[PDB]
């Protein structure tokens, strides 16, 4: 019953969107076609937060907050809220959509993470107070997806942790996104027009960079994205021989852990691509345009890349990396043909 997605904030957003009659995965995510390599690397000195060269992939494009806001005519706003205002802010957001509430891994008993706040904060969707007086929390990540109960006292404690490494105390993302009735009746039309726009951005194949205290950030869009991603990721072929060694220094141990994490985080983005492409296919079907693309399945191609990423970060075997590269090439090739034929009919 609970919706979910490979990124927990996206699954959370999907549940809020459904409250107001919006199918996030089909009409918002699925309507935003995108493909992008991102790199963080040495730029202009000094960059004190640059800890390592880092590369990943994204199919999020402009991201669901921008898309959801303009498609519904609403707003997606991050704020920090005082403890005395939290419950009333949740009830006020609820009348118009909902709230993404940030909180540490260790505050959520179902995550079984009492020992650590996580590398990044968790997010949940409050679902009002049950008749028995407990608050309900919706979990948007697929692995733990579901609804959970928490006392009002535990909820407020969870929202204002001390210490607060992630700086999530009172942090709410408010989704006030209830469309007008006429807008809601038109949503598929807006999704169709967003669909064509993202396809044009993708074929435009723009790119850029920006110098930040955490390094130079480089991005490249479009058909070029996955070839450039593969060429860059080749640089991590040292991971498997290094991981195989048993004379590892503390440094080389960190090298392996962070290299594995690079590929774990990449794998979550491959999963998101699979999820978003499947959304695009459902959108296209409902729009009557499935004849345009003639059986091409970018959703399955990215699902294969996803599985290859899982095997790689789990095992770091010698040939897992090349298998991942093969799967990505195939997904890149399906994507470009799918996009070209779909855009022709739009």
């Amino acid at each position: 019953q609970t919706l979910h997605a490979p990124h927990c904030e996206v699954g959370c957003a999907a549940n809020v969107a459904r409250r107001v009659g919006v199918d996030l995965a089909r009409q918002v995510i699925g309507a935003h076609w995108a493909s992008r390599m991102l790199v963080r690397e040495v730029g202009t000195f000094p960059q004190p937060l640059l800890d390592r060269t880092q590369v990943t992939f994204s199919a999020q494009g402009e991201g669901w907050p921008a898309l959801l806001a303009r498609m519904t005519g609403g707003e997606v706003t991050s704020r920090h809220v005082p403890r005395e205002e939290l419950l009333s802010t949740l009830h006020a957001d609820r009348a118009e959509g909902g709230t993404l509430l940030f909180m540490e891994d260790r505050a959520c008993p179902w995550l079984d993470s009492a020992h650590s706040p996580g590398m990044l904060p968790h997010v949940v969707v409050p679902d009002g107070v049950a008749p028995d007086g407990s608050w309900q929390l919706i979990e948007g990540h697929s692995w733990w997806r579901g609804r959970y109960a928490m006392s009002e006292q535990d909820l407020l404690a969870a929202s204002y942790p001390d210490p607060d490494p992630h700086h999530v105390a009172g942090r709410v993302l408010s989704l006030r996104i209830r469309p007008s009735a006429e807008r809601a009746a038109q949503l598929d039309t807006l999704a169709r027009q967003e669909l064509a726009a993202g396809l044009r951005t993708y074929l435009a194949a723009e790119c850029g960079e920006t110098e930040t205290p955490a390094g130079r950030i480089v991005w490249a869009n479009g058909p070029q994205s996955v070839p450039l991603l593969v060429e860059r990721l080749r640089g991590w072929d040292y991971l498997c021989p290094l991981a195989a060694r048993n004379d590892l220094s503390t440094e080389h141990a960190r090298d392996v852990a962070l290299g594995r994490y690079l590929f774990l985080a990449l794998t979550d983005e491959l999963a998101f691509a699979a999820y978003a492409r499947a959304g695009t296919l459902r959108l296209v079907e409902g729009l009557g345009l499935a004849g345009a693309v003639g059986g091409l399945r970018p959703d399955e191609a990215w699902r294969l890349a996803w599985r290859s990423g899982q095997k790689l970060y789990r095992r770091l075997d010698r040939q897992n990396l090349s298998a991942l590269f093969s799967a990505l090439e195939k997904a890149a090739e399906v994507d470009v043909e799918y996009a070209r034929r779909l855009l022709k009919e739009l």
């Binding site: 699902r303 599985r307 789990r314």
Partner: protein, 76 residues
């Protein structure tokens, strides 16, 4: 028979032959199986029955042998 097939493929992934394996045995909440075991299960399933998408990789679907067989049956 699918429930029988799942239990069979699960048996060599357990840490010891001592380990009780019933349809209701908890596999992942109980730390009984690790990430490498999950890879074997996913690979077994796409080789034999159905290519499971991310949407189906949930603790609910994979925590017991009965849930796994349910997942295969429902999605095949």
């Amino acid at each position: 028979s699918l429930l029988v097939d799942v239990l069979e493929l699960l048996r060599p992934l357990l840490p010891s032959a001592d380990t009780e394996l019933t349809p209701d045995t908890e596999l992942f909440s109980s730390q009984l199986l690790d990430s490498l075991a999950l890879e074997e299960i996913q690979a077994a399933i796409e080789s034999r029955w159905v290519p499971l998408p991310p949407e189906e990789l949930t603790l609910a679907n994979f925590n017991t042998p009965a849930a796994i067989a349910e997942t295969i049956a429902r999605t095949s």
